[PDB]
């Protein structure tokens, strides 16, 4: 901005759209379902680079809930459900991922580097409540 | 939503828009500059009822000084505090803009997570370090 007014302008604005927001399996981060906000071979392209994201993510989730003794790690409670938000630095990307509460799903959110983290956590904790015929999910044989 | 792909699609979307923003004196409440996000008589009500909404939580700021959730900050040395304030139905968030006689003050719907006000008037603090220190005269 230019000016006081113009400055107060742009506080009124949104933040804009997420990259990608998927549901994937917590066993091997397969993707289940998507959404992005974005030719033929670029559309593909695109679908592997968020298989490889996902990939990713659910191994550093992973790691981290196997971790006994990691962007930041924010327990949260649903109707008495638990689990965990965790945020993750991907490449200049910002990432935010939590299983999906008693199931075998993740729901991971993926941001430009200039989306804060910490409305990451909040949109993430919001969506999970949207998702409770999910609680619980499990996925049977895969091979 | 009705299925999973809508679902997903709705958590791609912006947050909306403020219902207003503004610098008001931190000494009475009063309006320096302000913005709204959107017919004479509707027009003044409107800045009526925004000069009443900056007065009361100026005022409640005020309480909380000399004694709703406070998040302390620090902006290269400098140190404020951030307050939210339940309105009536709406949503609000002021700081001092720090070492100044100035508030940064935001309103919103209901809907609006106050940890993204929080969140949000930290930032656009950042953007205002002309303003620091900035103290009013006389106001007679």
Known sequence: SKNVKGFLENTLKPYGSLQSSMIITATNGGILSYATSNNSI??????????????????KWSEDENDTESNSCYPVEIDSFKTKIYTYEMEDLHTCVAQIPNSDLLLLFIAEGS?????????????????????GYKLGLEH
């Open 42 to 59: 670029n559309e593909i392209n695109s679908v592997n680079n968020l298989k490889m994201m996902s990939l990713l993510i659910k191994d």
């Open 115 to 135: 989306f804060p983290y910490g409305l990451l956590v909040i949109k993430i904790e919001r969506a999970m409540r949207e998702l409770t015929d999910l609680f």
